[PDB]
Ligand binder design. Sequence first.
Ligand code: HEM
Length: 147
Amino acid sequence: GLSAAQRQVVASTWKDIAGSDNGAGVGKECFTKFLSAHHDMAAVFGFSGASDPGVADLGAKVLAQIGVAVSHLGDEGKMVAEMKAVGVRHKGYGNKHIKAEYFEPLGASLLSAMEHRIGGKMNAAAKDAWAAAYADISGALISGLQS
Ligand code: HEM
């Protein structure tokens, strides 16, 4: 699971990529590749491919969640309180599908995008900490997900 160092290496890489945009250019470029490589979900998000500005609307709003979740990682006292609520919302979306199997990929593929901003600071302890933490952030959302 998350370690004492990874949990810290997470808040150290989120205070640079998000900064003020909170990951605005991290979700629009992350979900974009996901929607494309994943056409079965492109219709679930509400786009016609990886060329719709709507993606930046979801990723930008999704990245923020991970940001608020990066300040807790193991702290599931409140972090899961909001994330768990997201799942309860996804289960009541329009596609009526959503799967945690897609979360991992959308999470791992996200790290490949993070390097875009802190490409000079994204070190091994940074991509491995967010790769293991993304499982707890997106995983905690699977609590209220899947009605
Ligand atoms: C890969 C599986 C996922 C699918 C298919 C999915 C799909 C969606 C869809 C369809 C929407 C709303 C579409 C619209 O804008 O009309 C949405 C919103 C959202 N998703 Fe996801 N999502 C997934 C994973 C995640 C994960 C892992 C997170 C957490 C990091 C997340 C966080 C959010 C947030 C925060 C919103 C917006 C809620 C708000 O209005 O505040 N989603 N998602």
